[PDB]
Ligand binder design. Structure first.
Ligand code: CU
Ligand code: CU
Ligand code: CU
Lengths: 27, 27, 27
């Protein structure tokens, strides 16, 4: 369960980076 | 504590999906 | 490990709030 939480957070970090890039390009 | 972490991640997944939709509509 | 997961989630919550503000200003 703890390793699954760590994996989910790792995928979320990746999506956050992509979202910020997209918003940065617009701005 | 572990179940609280799982709940927080579930809410974050939901917000990520809504953010990507909004950015997708703009793009 | 559990406290590290809690810290990572706290930083993610902060980034989500900033992302939603930026998207809200655009919309
Ligand atoms: Cu990786
Ligand atoms: Cu649900
Ligand atoms: Cu703080």
């Amino acid at each position: 369960q703890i390793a699954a939480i760590k994996x989910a957070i790792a995928a979320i970090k990746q999506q956050i980076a992509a979202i910020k890039e997209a918003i940065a390009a617009i701005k």
